[PDB]
Symmetry: D2
Subunit: 164 residues, 4 copies
């Protein structure tokens, strides 16, 4: 029930990382960053929706690595984070830093989501999509409910940080 | 006295634009933008100082065009603004949008500031500096006091938006 | 023998694309592009090595899609190419265009290269690597020899464009 | 006569730098660089025009610092060049390096060109223009002829590098 409360009326985005290190840093530090165009879209979504849920997948892994709620709009951030940037990209191109509240840090293999389709991506399987693909409400809710419950996470701390 | 109150313990930055259009848009809309690296520095300065004052100069103009107080940290912004970007730069590289409260929208020719030197730039005349050059407290205060008073601006509205 | 001739003393790079579209365009038009940092690295490699071989893999495909020889240093480009760019990145950030001479446009599944490890990447299977990972001479040679012969390609045309 | 020969049928571009350092480096090393969008435009102009002439002006200097002929399309570069970059921009964003053949390294004050208007920029004085502004043939020719002869330059070396 607590997870479903967190997910009520949420918007869902599929976030694809080229490597494991960025998702590991996000789990360790509770933060996320991206290019300004995407940052703008996330900030708009954050102000417009009861919750914004990021569902993370490392390409070539065949799995989702967890999901998290946007905790606030982006801000300047602290000391540099050693993100692993795509070949040739300068860290000077990154925007601000989002604080994220992890709801599940456990993995879900794509084999377990093979029955779900995203109406907002031509009913392709929900694993399929470009970085930032939005997942329709009911599909995104079912996908999140497929993850194993994460006993290392206190959903009350997630619920307390909600300001809807 | 009101202007001096606004300037108390402020930090001052010299902001140089390649063209008039960006400063005109900033006066019309009460906003400013820049690349993320600079945005980060302005956001940090905003949280650290009683006031952050931007002093604007259009290159090749021989003048300052006015000065404004940072009103808040940067945010996603509204509809695109038709900023005039340097040749070859994508608007996708810009960070968020700062709201600024204009304190003076009138010009000051460089000839009138020729007696002031910036200790934080090797005592070069205060007109001299790369974009973002910081101006020492007393020098920056004297420079702002050289501008003609702007009767079109209500300093009470500036003072009311201060949250120190 | 013709393939082994082209590959003599070659340098090999694993090129990872996040979508099929860019590799399909490269196959149709015989060109490639990327960010200026990587463009510089490819131009340096082209000028010094007898051949530079790009081995392409679309992430999440579980296959290599083919491989090609760099035919020239990068140049202006000519006609526009509707590359698919990472979210939030501008085509204005891209460097010039390389002419590439395809050697094989047929696919090779990762299962077929399970016995090849790359000694310049910690002896990990050669399918593993960040974008641009260099592959040691003998490992890259054997990987290219694993691809099925591509009758649609005239290796004499590839060989005749060599200027060693 | 030698100068008029070099300038026959040339295209002329006004290049505006925000600091003296970049123009000083260009004069010392005989090279130029810029963002890929502008690099593409310069490479196109080089391939089609008999000569491409870059006329340099450091903003706020009130002078042109000299002019040079594009000697080649852009290339990798070679040795590093410690260009001064706009605040917040990364050297990784820059394109390749153009070889330039200086024709005059002596300065021309704007007061000396007050009679030349650029018909491809609304008949504004030729000193006026955004970075990269193209200058009509006869106006650019007369502007270059206004510079003082530069005995330190051997125009035969410039002429011998022409490949029209
Ligand atoms: O946040 C990401 N992407 C996104 C795309 C679109 C949209 C939206 C579009 N429309 C509505 S939301 C939202 C987010 C996004 C980030 C990464 C990283 O690996 C990463 C992480 C941190 C720093 C640097 C990087 C790195 F530079 F390496 F990329 C992959 N993805
Ligand atoms: O804000 C600017 N620069 C800055 C530099 C350094 C620092 C700091 C460094 N350290 C502490 S603060 C702060 C601000 C800055 C902006 C401009 C513009 O013309 C402009 C305006 C709006 C949109 C796009 C642009 C455009 F893209 F065209 F540039 C010039 N300047
Ligand atoms: O060329 C690429 N990468 C590379 C990295 C490192 C090195 C080297 C490092 N050291 C020696 S070589 C060489 C090449 C590279 C390109 C892509 C694309 O999908 C692509 C294709 C065309 C246009 C735009 C893009 C897009 F913008 F979408 F990316 C993925 N990869
Ligand atoms: O080359 C430049 N601009 C250009 C604009 C448009 C066009 C054309 C448009 N249409 C046909 S040609 C051609 C050239 C241009 C370069 C600079 C620099 O100071 C500079 C120099 C070297 C490295 C880095 C920089 C720095 F990063 F600092 F900028 C100013 N300007």
């Amino acid at each position: 029930s607590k997870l479903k409360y967190v997910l009520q009326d949420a918007r869902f985005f599929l976030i694809k990382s080229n490597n494991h290190e960025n998702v590991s840093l996000a789990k360790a530090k509770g933060v996320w960053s991206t290019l300004p165009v995407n940052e703008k879209k996330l900030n708009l979504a954050f102000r417009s929706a009861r919750s914004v849920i990021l569902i993370f997948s490392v390409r070539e892994s065949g799995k989702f690595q967890g999901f998290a709620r946007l905790s606030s709009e982006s801000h300047h951030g602290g000391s540099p984070i050693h993100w692993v940037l795509p070949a040739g990209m300068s860290a000077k191109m990154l925007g601000g830093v989002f604080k994220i509240d992890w709801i599940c840090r456990r993995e879900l293999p794509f084999t377990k989501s093979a029955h779900l389709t995203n109406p907002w991506n031509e009913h392709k399987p929900v694993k399929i999509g470009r970085d930032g693909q939005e997942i329709e409400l009911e599909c995104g809710t079912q996908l999140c409910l497929l993850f194993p419950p994460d006993e290392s996470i206190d959903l009350y701390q997630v619920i307390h940080k909600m300001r809807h």
